[PDB]
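Thread: assembly with ligand

MN 10:42: here's the input set. Chains plus the small molecule as SMILES. Want everything predicted jointly, not piecewise.
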Amino acid sequence: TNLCPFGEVFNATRFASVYAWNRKRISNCVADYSVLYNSASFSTFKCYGVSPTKLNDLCFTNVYADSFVIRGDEVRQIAPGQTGKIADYNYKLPDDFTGCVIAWNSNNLDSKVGGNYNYLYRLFRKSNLKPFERDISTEIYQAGSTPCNGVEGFNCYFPLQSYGFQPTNGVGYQPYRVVVLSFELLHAPATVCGP
Amino acid sequence: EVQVLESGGGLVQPGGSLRLSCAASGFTFSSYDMSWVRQAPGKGLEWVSGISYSGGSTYYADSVKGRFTISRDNSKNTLYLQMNSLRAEDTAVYYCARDVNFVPLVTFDYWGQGTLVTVQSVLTQPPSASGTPGQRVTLSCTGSSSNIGSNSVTWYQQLPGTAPKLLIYDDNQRPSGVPDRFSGSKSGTSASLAISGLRSEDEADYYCGTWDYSLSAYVFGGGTKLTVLVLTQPPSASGTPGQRVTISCSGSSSNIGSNAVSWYQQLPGTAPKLLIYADNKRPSGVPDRFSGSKSGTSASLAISGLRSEDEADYYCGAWDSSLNAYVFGGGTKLTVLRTVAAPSVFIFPPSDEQLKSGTASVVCLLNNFYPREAKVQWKVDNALQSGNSQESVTEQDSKDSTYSLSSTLTLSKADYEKHKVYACEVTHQGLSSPVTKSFNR
Amino acid sequence: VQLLESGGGLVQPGGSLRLSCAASGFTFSDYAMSWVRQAPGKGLEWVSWIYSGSGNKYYADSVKGRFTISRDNSKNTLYLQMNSLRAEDTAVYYCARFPIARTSNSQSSYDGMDVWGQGTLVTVSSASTKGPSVFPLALGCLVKDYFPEPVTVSWNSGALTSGVHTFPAVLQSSGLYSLSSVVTCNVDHKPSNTKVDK
Ligand SMILES: *[C@@H]1O[C@H](CO)[C@@H](O)[C@H](O)[C@H]1NC(C)=O
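BT 11:07: finished. Tokens for the full assembly:
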């Protein structure tokens, strides 16, 4: 009856930038998703491919908690088939998504007067990010023909831009922490079940 | 299909009860927040209540606070509004709206067909706004720092007799199915929608909706029934209205050959507008006639179908890989070939406050004349001015597409009375016979 | 999307001042920013361009050293310190948003100069200001001996709009500008801060 340590994911004191989103494996465990779904802290609980009411009924081989911090106006980019600068460039979900997305406002945790520049996002990369891919590489984005030897300038923009997370920003610009539960079941025995 | 049917509306009596039930299919109904919105017959939308994804948090409008219970049964994926102790003001049509996003950035995309139940707005949106076909109409919402400033502003277009339709969400974006014509805007505690060009299908009621972190409700807007009633570049290209003018600029390989050219249209007295951003591509909000094409080192801006709004300075700009500078073109002065007009000629003797000021500035004017080439000679009793008169011509008129020129002769206070008659002779193609009003002292 | 410039006014030759460009309506950190000069009645002369403070700042060949561009993404502002100003720099400065991002779904001015602010006006001259003098004259009204350009001239405070032609001011021997509005006249001179109803 070892309950799943969702506290180390949802209640973590320091989340990760959306480009370098953390991924925690959950298995050898029992997880009650009804507590998360019936929690008032979460502003968004969008389940794709499954239904949250039946989450405790099903079992999967393992769960992946993909934790990051995005902008409010940007939370709608964590749905399957969405496009933009987070979905296409930072964290892509396949249209055949079997999981859930859990977004809660975290202004009082990840904002700072003057800007919480500790959170970043990837404006620049060659191709759209493959679903469930992350790229932590900070390589100068050559947008032009001329190789410029890795100096930040025209057609050599730094690929990562910072998030301006101030407590006075409008809700669409406030830091929302997002945890994506990706559910995987296969020939390996279903190990993470729900009460 | 993400359709949301709804029923439970009919004839009831004040002080009674009524159960409205709407069933949603095609999406995970148990993951999206939903809400009940109300529209009185011939009145703006009034947001009744709203229930979260889990059904745990419920929000109610203070006009209906304490007497309506919003409920949600996820097993059957249906959602209910229990109306109790009804009033006469509740006779309206009810919709249940799917909420795309969490609160506060509420976004109502899919709406029910409408249940006819028979038994003030925070956002001071204008009661109405009149537009014309092809116009650029800005209908502006207005709210406090809790309504507009902190939460997303969403614009709904309700056609007469239909459910509302989302146009703008998150203050800037548009759904998949809304033309780019509509553009959101938000500044401080005031939001707005800009419709660039209007058609017969823009005749609808436009509402602005925003959540409140203080009022804890999704206040709507009021009405606003929209009614339809070096880059070497040529110095001055031109063409007749309806023609296709080619403005071709050329730099170098570093200037333009290996970098993306852009074309900007600076109307007189206004900031430039980017008409072309790639070598070929064109930003939204610009007429499709403004084509661009960069062949090798020469970029061509083709303006087809000139009009009175097409006369402006068209600059081409491209980044330099060598000089490291966004070098602009010389600036092509595009003007339309209008039929030669008749210069209306006027003259003014200097006022007596000129005499009290110590100078005398006598002015001669030529209004509504084409083309730009025209001369004014100050014939002061068969005598010509010697390099003292100064004149500047207007730009081509925004609507009449014609010119206006004013010549000012600034002479000494004692010079005004030492002579008796002052006159200005005009030389223009539109008036072969010179026209002059000879005022006297 | 709107960019508002502030800091345009009287400048002594060789002086120092600061243009501040407040940018709203877009994620300020994602788009490059630039300043563009326009001498009165002349073409667009690019001033400078920036994307990141720690990155490379690009300047026009004629302004290298005497200009300094900077950003403040917390305030969503673009700053331009201009010092040791020379005579030819009297102009109108536009704050222009130069997009560089490509979202692969809908290109939005990915390499152009997308949106231009209203632009301020900088006069690098030691000459002092002088209040406009309005003289009523197709009804017209001259406005002479005001320094510097611009002055906002209108008929009936904007009530009468059709037929109001305004011609650009001129540089006289005294160095004092003059326009006239032709069809009461409202003449509003911001640098001298005088509102005149004649
Ligand atoms: C986070 O902490 C709060 C403290 O009130 C608790 O209620 C909640 O269950 C915690 N969440 C997790 C995932 O441990």
